[PDB]
Amino acid sequence: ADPDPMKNTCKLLVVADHRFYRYMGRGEESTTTNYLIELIDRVDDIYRNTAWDNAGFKGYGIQIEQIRILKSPQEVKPGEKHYNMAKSYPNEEKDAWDVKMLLEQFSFDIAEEASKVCLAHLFTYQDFDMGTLGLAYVGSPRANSHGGVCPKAYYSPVGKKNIYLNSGLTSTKNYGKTILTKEADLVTTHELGHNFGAEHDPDGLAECAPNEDQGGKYVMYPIAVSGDHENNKMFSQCSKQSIYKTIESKAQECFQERS
Ligand SMILES: CC#CCOc1ccc(S(=O)(=O)CCCS)cc1
Ligand SMILES: [Zn+2]
Numbered sequence: 577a578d579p580d581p582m583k584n585t586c587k588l589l590v591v592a593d594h595r596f597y598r599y600m601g602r603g604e605e606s607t608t609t610n611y612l613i614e615l616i617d618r619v620d621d622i623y624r625n626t627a628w629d630n631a632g633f634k635g636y637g638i639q640i641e642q643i644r645i646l647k648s649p650q651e652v653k654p655g656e657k658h659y660n661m662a663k664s665y666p667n668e669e670k671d672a673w674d675v676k677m678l679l680e681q682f683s684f685d686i687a688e689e690a691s692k693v694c695l696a697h698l699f700t701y702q703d704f705d706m707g708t709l710g711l712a713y714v715g716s717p718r719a720n721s722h723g724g725v726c727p728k729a730y731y732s733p734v735g736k737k738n739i740y741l742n743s744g745l746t747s748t749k750n751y752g753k754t755i756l757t758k759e760a761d762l763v764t765t766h767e768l769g770h771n772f773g774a775e776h777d778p779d780g781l782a783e784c785a786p787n788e789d790q791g792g793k794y795v796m797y798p799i800a801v802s803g804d805h806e807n808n809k810m811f812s813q814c815s816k817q818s819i820y821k822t823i824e825s826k827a828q829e830c831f832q833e834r835s
């Protein structure tokens with residue numbers, strides 16, 4: 577039962593849309609790719625060091641399998657929408673999409689690709705309302721659940737095709753600024769945390785949402801952590817129970833060796 581290493585890695589499709597390309601990668605393929613390679617690796621460090629059952633079940637994490645860089649916005653006909661299109665939807669006045677809407681759109685458009693990988697993830701640069709940084713579908717052990725690690729076919733029927741909810745997204749813009757790289761790390765940690773099966777930490781449970789002199793909140797706190805408190809970049813026990821339940825199962829399903 578011990579961690580069969582041949583299956584300890586969730587492989588990622590990483591997608592940078594033209595916004596991220598323009599404003600984070602400075603309109604360069606190289607600068608864009610290296611940002612994302614370095615980020616996923618740093619996030620992997622946190623996952624792989626996490627002992628999900630507080631015992632031997634550790635050394636699990638993520639690794640990029642494919643990077644997609646969309647250097648320009650997606651041509652689109654009136655009526656049409658696409659996650660990489662130049663205008664925000666629904667309200668085209670805003671800097672950004674409605675985030676739920678965005679994650680849906682991306683899940684539609686990237687369907688074919690997502691089928692080939694444990695998770696697909698969009699990195700974008702837009703200023704979602706209310707300090708929203710990203711979103712992702714929560715994974716589950718349940719044989720028939722939708723969302724999270726491991727592609728599992730679902731028929732929409734908003735889109736009229738199979739989609740996989742093994743997805744989530746990260747935005748590196750918040751309240752009119754590029755967020756710090758130490759903040760991006762945590763946004764993606766947390767968004768991938770949802771994929772891996774974690775819910776937000778309950779505000780009540782003192783143990784999984786500690787005070788500042790206890791080390792502060794953990795990474796699955798619903799409100800963004802500032803990042804400097806001891807607990808900020810770590811998973812709470814709540815998160816570990818939820819994720820262990822999902823992983824213990826889903827790992828056999830689609831996790832792989834490091835490639
Ligand atoms: C810096 C930092 C950090 C921790 O990770 C997140 C915290 C809150 C959000 S949010 O505000 O979009 C609410 C959660 C939606 S998934 C998204 C990610
Ligand atoms: Zn914002």
Ligand SMILES: [Zn+2]
Pocket residue numbers: 766770776798
């Ligand atoms: Zn969340």
